[PDB]
């Protein structure tokens, strides 16, 4: 009855925001949700609690002993729409696997059963940059079932969406993990919405929704709140709600069909993003050629 | 060799030179064993703090557990009912160990059967093993009731105990009014205590679910008492005794105190006393229902409060001075019977004892383990005595419990260095006793080894084991002991202080060395 | 004489490029240098070796059996001015610590003894987005000593830097992996440059240089080559050549004094980068 979703994607592209607003809109509908930050940056809840930076498990844990030294009381907080959120905790510089900090945060929640609790949804905000075994954690332990990738028109951003798909498959066979779809964050690029859907198909999935770039958003952030708790009547507001509906009834939980760096390139250059390689001028000075 | 006059058994037979030189060849010759010096290396390693860290990181491996499966408790529970025959619907090999296990702990005959399901049933369940089974059993050991439980197999292939039972009645394998309560008991869920919970619940239903109409809380002026998974006869008794001494009308639900101590008079009884069925049927009419070992009777409290509509109190297992008070009181409150001078005195005496020998118990570090209620009650009591329960382990416990305990620990100066662990096993505890060494271990026989180990490292490192719990095999008749109530408190208090003094003697028995502190009067 | 370096930085600011161009200067300046690509994208040698994408030890070992199947020319390839370039190799997508593939890579460069061969410098291009065990490996094993951080005048770019410092602070009490300053890549931000040195010292080191942004780079790269080789006459080529020496000469190899998150919230509003913190504005809003 409780669906476990996780949002993956490259960093610095409003992913955490979209996610949080998604949950926000998801809250209005009446769905009890829970977010679990797995982004080393630790900032996946700020927009719900208004706080500048929630206390990560790994922090309070090193201020008590091991782990079960503390209690969900000061680790799990209820913000707007009664949403419950906890941030895993950034790995210790130089020493420590980010993934590690995640499991321990999950298992902890498992132990004090922060799950069994009428939750309809639980979103694991996960950074999907260098898709390693660390960040793949929530999928390996099989705690995440529905995967929604966040990206936009950009090589690296898409290059991530791809490698993440690769990852999903690596387990999708011996597991139930699936790729619900893609979410494109408007980066005000021409034919951006087109480029993603195209790519989605190559993977065998679909672009669940296209989040435009309204500025009412940057207003809420500054306010530390979500587009919803800020202006429940803005345009961008009903935009996310559209994503909420879509997710609630998605059916495309599939196993992506990864593509080659070349297949990928082919698209970019084709949508006007990437250039076209001039195999000849390669290694030619402004003098000889 | 043997001197017909003074025969030597396994030990010290093999200490004879020939046997010595015998095994020596076998070793060097074909064992290809690691040079001693290595074994000594590796060993020493395990007694370190480093090994601990590595040890506590275990996830998939479990070494020397401290819990058993559900059925084991379903069986025991079922034994508490008049002419009831524990029936475990599943592979027969299981029942084997069950009886076999209890026998070693009670040194009494454990009667229990199995509908011997096999491979040929891993596809079409055992809707037949049930049919024939129930019939065979009923006609052979002619019980008044048959309680059904399940084994690992049974649940994995998933069989509907209810259905199967309903058909065995329909198809005419056993009368239709023949009591056959049931409960699913998956090995892979909770410990043995959970079995009991289930089982009991399963019986409660069978006699009160389809007939709550003519029932009216308080109509009988009695209090129901559910002992839970108890293995110390003396307990069942002390409860009955205290209540009867209080003039309280009670109905002990699930009383195996008789079949577990049938006398040796020339004839074998497979059944003896126990909770009558009528007692169960009527239970609902009881003023209230008290749970002796709540921490593992939630599925019962639910049903009891939910159906019978009783206001089950928030009581702790009655162990130690404090809690037992609370128990007696709450009992009074309910029954309306004053606490008799008799008990007021027993108590006073328990206190006398405490004062009489605190000096020795004070500041004594213990490492212990067992079941939830038991463990926490033991912890509570040690605190009332001024000891420091440093390693409270409990393999089958949960988080909610761990908290309640920490709460108990935090409320006492003597709980500063206390740590509670759940999910951990005896191999973990093994380390906790090497690194952060206590003075004794309070637990079951499985702990006899941990001791051996502590000694292998050295006399000054050995940690004497104090048998209190379950199961116990290297000692006799301890199952007649008592841990509940004031009677219990006293026993434990003695088993303790004396265990301590027992050892202090051993440490100062050295002639002209340490025998100076070998005082006569202590 | 062989100073094993490391260039860390938030992926997406020029690190990879500025790193190629930094060395592109040394070899041309008569310096034997080997670039070890530790970035997961695997584009730490493309500009040197004039290649579209060099083969990582993984795409080969994983191919031809294992590691004991590869040679030296296979991965290690001397591009511009005799510069041996190797790519650590990304992690097996969804599995394996990306930093585990680097150990296996640096260790293998010692199996074919590719260091002892007349070389002046070693350059590790490690990704410093999240300083986890993976990317922190080259430092842990003391395989690098000179740590120069790439960090533009941008929120995250600078944060990563601060954190990389902390990565050093950890292995500093056992290894010789010291600091080396910052390398700010222009982005047209007012005071962006000082903003950097304003922080370099806050750590205990300096801003070894301020690389500007000339189209000659976006043109030199288009031609899978460095700005050095392209047009040594263009002033931008000087920016690179200048720093080149600054590095060699650089004597300051300290131990960072990692500031706090708030110390950064401060240093960034001091330069108008980060918006000033309001107050009653937060919370509830109609
Ligand atoms: S799995 Fe990823 S985050 Fe975890 S240690 Fe390896 S590289 Fe660092
Ligand atoms: Ca006997």
JSON list of C-alpha atoms in Angstrom, two decimals, chain C residues 171-268:
[
{"chain": "C", "resi": 171, "resn": "UNK", "atom": "CA", "xyz": [45.41, 12.35, 6.16]},
{"chain": "C", "resi": 172, "resn": "UNK", "atom": "CA", "xyz": [47.75, 15.25, 7.03]},
{"chain": "C", "resi": 173, "resn": "UNK", "atom": "CA", "xyz": [48.74, 13.72, 10.37]},
{"chain": "C", "resi": 174, "resn": "UNK", "atom": "CA", "xyz": [50.38, 10.77, 8.63]},
{"chain": "C", "resi": 175, "resn": "UNK", "atom": "CA", "xyz": [51.02, 11.78, 5.04]},
{"chain": "C", "resi": 176, "resn": "UNK", "atom": "CA", "xyz": [52.90, 14.50, 3.17]},
{"chain": "C", "resi": 177, "resn": "UNK", "atom": "CA", "xyz": [49.79, 15.39, 1.13]},
{"chain": "C", "resi": 178, "resn": "UNK", "atom": "CA", "xyz": [49.79, 19.14, 1.75]},
{"chain": "C", "resi": 179, "resn": "UNK", "atom": "CA", "xyz": [47.73, 21.94, 0.20]},
{"chain": "C", "resi": 180, "resn": "UNK", "atom": "CA", "xyz": [48.76, 24.10, -2.78]},
{"chain": "C", "resi": 181, "resn": "UNK", "atom": "CA", "xyz": [46.24, 26.87, -3.21]},
{"chain": "C", "resi": 182, "resn": "UNK", "atom": "CA", "xyz": [43.18, 27.53, -5.38]},
{"chain": "C", "resi": 183, "resn": "UNK", "atom": "CA", "xyz": [42.80, 27.99, -9.12]},
{"chain": "C", "resi": 184, "resn": "UNK", "atom": "CA", "xyz": [39.87, 30.28, -9.86]},
{"chain": "C", "resi": 185, "resn": "UNK", "atom": "CA", "xyz": [38.40, 29.90, -13.34]},
{"chain": "C", "resi": 186, "resn": "UNK", "atom": "CA", "xyz": [36.89, 33.20, -14.54]},
{"chain": "C", "resi": 187, "resn": "UNK", "atom": "CA", "xyz": [33.10, 33.38, -14.89]},
{"chain": "C", "resi": 188, "resn": "UNK", "atom": "CA", "xyz": [32.56, 37.16, -15.13]},
{"chain": "C", "resi": 189, "resn": "UNK", "atom": "CA", "xyz": [31.77, 37.60, -11.44]},
{"chain": "C", "resi": 190, "resn": "UNK", "atom": "CA", "xyz": [32.55, 40.92, -9.77]},
{"chain": "C", "resi": 191, "resn": "UNK", "atom": "CA", "xyz": [35.38, 40.45, -7.25]},
{"chain": "C", "resi": 192, "resn": "UNK", "atom": "CA", "xyz": [35.14, 36.74, -8.09]},
{"chain": "C", "resi": 193, "resn": "UNK", "atom": "CA", "xyz": [38.98, 36.64, -8.09]},
{"chain": "C", "resi": 194, "resn": "UNK", "atom": "CA", "xyz": [39.49, 38.36, -4.73]},
{"chain": "C", "resi": 195, "resn": "UNK", "atom": "CA", "xyz": [36.53, 36.37, -3.39]},
{"chain": "C", "resi": 196, "resn": "UNK", "atom": "CA", "xyz": [38.83, 33.41, -3.95]},
{"chain": "C", "resi": 197, "resn": "UNK", "atom": "CA", "xyz": [41.98, 34.75, -2.30]},
{"chain": "C", "resi": 198, "resn": "UNK", "atom": "CA", "xyz": [39.69, 36.14, 0.36]},
{"chain": "C", "resi": 199, "resn": "UNK", "atom": "CA", "xyz": [39.04, 32.45, 1.12]},
{"chain": "C", "resi": 200, "resn": "UNK", "atom": "CA", "xyz": [42.39, 30.93, 0.14]},
{"chain": "C", "resi": 201, "resn": "UNK", "atom": "CA", "xyz": [43.95, 32.57, 3.18]},
{"chain": "C", "resi": 202, "resn": "UNK", "atom": "CA", "xyz": [40.92, 31.75, 5.32]},
{"chain": "C", "resi": 203, "resn": "UNK", "atom": "CA", "xyz": [42.22, 28.22, 4.79]},
{"chain": "C", "resi": 204, "resn": "UNK", "atom": "CA", "xyz": [45.91, 28.98, 5.16]},
{"chain": "C", "resi": 205, "resn": "UNK", "atom": "CA", "xyz": [47.10, 29.04, 1.55]},
{"chain": "C", "resi": 206, "resn": "UNK", "atom": "CA", "xyz": [46.79, 31.20, -1.59]},
{"chain": "C", "resi": 207, "resn": "UNK", "atom": "CA", "xyz": [45.13, 31.58, -5.01]},
{"chain": "C", "resi": 208, "resn": "UNK", "atom": "CA", "xyz": [47.99, 30.24, -7.15]},
{"chain": "C", "resi": 209, "resn": "UNK", "atom": "CA", "xyz": [46.35, 31.99, -10.16]},
{"chain": "C", "resi": 210, "resn": "UNK", "atom": "CA", "xyz": [43.21, 33.42, -11.72]},
{"chain": "C", "resi": 211, "resn": "UNK", "atom": "CA", "xyz": [42.50, 31.78, -15.08]},
{"chain": "C", "resi": 212, "resn": "UNK", "atom": "CA", "xyz": [40.33, 34.02, -17.33]},
{"chain": "C", "resi": 213, "resn": "UNK", "atom": "CA", "xyz": [37.81, 32.88, -19.91]},
{"chain": "C", "resi": 214, "resn": "UNK", "atom": "CA", "xyz": [38.90, 33.45, -23.51]},
{"chain": "C", "resi": 215, "resn": "UNK", "atom": "CA", "xyz": [37.04, 32.01, -26.52]},
{"chain": "C", "resi": 216, "resn": "UNK", "atom": "CA", "xyz": [40.45, 30.75, -27.67]},
{"chain": "C", "resi": 217, "resn": "UNK", "atom": "CA", "xyz": [39.75, 27.89, -25.27]},
{"chain": "C", "resi": 218, "resn": "UNK", "atom": "CA", "xyz": [36.26, 27.09, -26.51]},
{"chain": "C", "resi": 219, "resn": "UNK", "atom": "CA", "xyz": [37.95, 27.10, -29.92]},
{"chain": "C", "resi": 220, "resn": "UNK", "atom": "CA", "xyz": [41.11, 25.19, -28.92]},
{"chain": "C", "resi": 221, "resn": "UNK", "atom": "CA", "xyz": [38.96, 22.48, -27.34]},
{"chain": "C", "resi": 222, "resn": "UNK", "atom": "CA", "xyz": [36.65, 22.21, -30.33]},
{"chain": "C", "resi": 223, "resn": "UNK", "atom": "CA", "xyz": [39.84, 21.05, -32.05]},
{"chain": "C", "resi": 224, "resn": "UNK", "atom": "CA", "xyz": [40.43, 18.32, -29.43]},
{"chain": "C", "resi": 225, "resn": "UNK", "atom": "CA", "xyz": [43.55, 20.27, -28.36]},
{"chain": "C", "resi": 226, "resn": "UNK", "atom": "CA", "xyz": [44.90, 22.71, -25.76]},
{"chain": "C", "resi": 227, "resn": "UNK", "atom": "CA", "xyz": [45.13, 26.52, -26.12]},
{"chain": "C", "resi": 228, "resn": "UNK", "atom": "CA", "xyz": [48.89, 26.14, -25.78]},
{"chain": "C", "resi": 229, "resn": "UNK", "atom": "CA", "xyz": [49.33, 24.07, -28.98]},
{"chain": "C", "resi": 230, "resn": "UNK", "atom": "CA", "xyz": [46.59, 26.00, -30.84]},
{"chain": "C", "resi": 231, "resn": "UNK", "atom": "CA", "xyz": [47.88, 29.59, -30.62]},
{"chain": "C", "resi": 232, "resn": "UNK", "atom": "CA", "xyz": [50.85, 30.22, -28.25]},
{"chain": "C", "resi": 233, "resn": "UNK", "atom": "CA", "xyz": [50.64, 33.86, -29.38]},
{"chain": "C", "resi": 234, "resn": "UNK", "atom": "CA", "xyz": [47.15, 34.43, -27.92]},
{"chain": "C", "resi": 235, "resn": "UNK", "atom": "CA", "xyz": [47.42, 36.13, -24.51]},
{"chain": "C", "resi": 236, "resn": "UNK", "atom": "CA", "xyz": [45.32, 33.36, -22.96]},
{"chain": "C", "resi": 237, "resn": "UNK", "atom": "CA", "xyz": [48.21, 30.94, -23.58]},
{"chain": "C", "resi": 238, "resn": "UNK", "atom": "CA", "xyz": [50.26, 33.16, -21.27]},
{"chain": "C", "resi": 239, "resn": "UNK", "atom": "CA", "xyz": [47.76, 32.81, -18.41]},
{"chain": "C", "resi": 240, "resn": "UNK", "atom": "CA", "xyz": [48.47, 29.09, -18.58]},
{"chain": "C", "resi": 241, "resn": "UNK", "atom": "CA", "xyz": [52.23, 29.35, -19.06]},
{"chain": "C", "resi": 242, "resn": "UNK", "atom": "CA", "xyz": [52.40, 31.84, -16.15]},
{"chain": "C", "resi": 243, "resn": "UNK", "atom": "CA", "xyz": [50.69, 29.48, -13.64]},
{"chain": "C", "resi": 244, "resn": "UNK", "atom": "CA", "xyz": [52.76, 26.55, -14.97]},
{"chain": "C", "resi": 245, "resn": "UNK", "atom": "CA", "xyz": [55.88, 28.05, -13.38]},
{"chain": "C", "resi": 246, "resn": "UNK", "atom": "CA", "xyz": [54.00, 29.32, -10.32]},
{"chain": "C", "resi": 247, "resn": "UNK", "atom": "CA", "xyz": [53.33, 25.65, -9.61]},
{"chain": "C", "resi": 248, "resn": "UNK", "atom": "CA", "xyz": [56.91, 24.37, -10.09]},
{"chain": "C", "resi": 249, "resn": "UNK", "atom": "CA", "xyz": [58.27, 27.21, -7.98]},
{"chain": "C", "resi": 250, "resn": "UNK", "atom": "CA", "xyz": [55.38, 27.11, -5.47]},
{"chain": "C", "resi": 251, "resn": "UNK", "atom": "CA", "xyz": [56.95, 26.38, -2.10]},
{"chain": "C", "resi": 252, "resn": "UNK", "atom": "CA", "xyz": [53.84, 26.79, 0.02]},
{"chain": "C", "resi": 253, "resn": "UNK", "atom": "CA", "xyz": [52.38, 23.34, 0.78]},
{"chain": "C", "resi": 254, "resn": "UNK", "atom": "CA", "xyz": [50.37, 23.87, 3.98]},
{"chain": "C", "resi": 255, "resn": "UNK", "atom": "CA", "xyz": [47.58, 22.10, 5.85]},
{"chain": "C", "resi": 256, "resn": "UNK", "atom": "CA", "xyz": [44.10, 23.64, 5.32]},
{"chain": "C", "resi": 257, "resn": "UNK", "atom": "CA", "xyz": [42.13, 25.29, 8.12]},
{"chain": "C", "resi": 258, "resn": "UNK", "atom": "CA", "xyz": [38.59, 24.31, 6.93]},
{"chain": "C", "resi": 259, "resn": "UNK", "atom": "CA", "xyz": [36.17, 27.07, 7.80]},
{"chain": "C", "resi": 260, "resn": "UNK", "atom": "CA", "xyz": [32.56, 26.47, 8.74]},
{"chain": "C", "resi": 261, "resn": "UNK", "atom": "CA", "xyz": [29.40, 26.46, 6.68]},
{"chain": "C", "resi": 262, "resn": "UNK", "atom": "CA", "xyz": [28.39, 29.75, 8.31]},
{"chain": "C", "resi": 263, "resn": "UNK", "atom": "CA", "xyz": [31.86, 31.18, 7.71]},
{"chain": "C", "resi": 264, "resn": "UNK", "atom": "CA", "xyz": [31.06, 30.61, 4.02]},
{"chain": "C", "resi": 265, "resn": "UNK", "atom": "CA", "xyz": [27.52, 31.98, 4.24]},
{"chain": "C", "resi": 266, "resn": "UNK", "atom": "CA", "xyz": [29.41, 35.05, 5.38]},
{"chain": "C", "resi": 267, "resn": "UNK", "atom": "CA", "xyz": [32.30, 35.21, 2.91]},
{"chain": "C", "resi": 268, "resn": "UNK", "atom": "CA", "xyz": [29.75, 34.91, 0.06]}
]
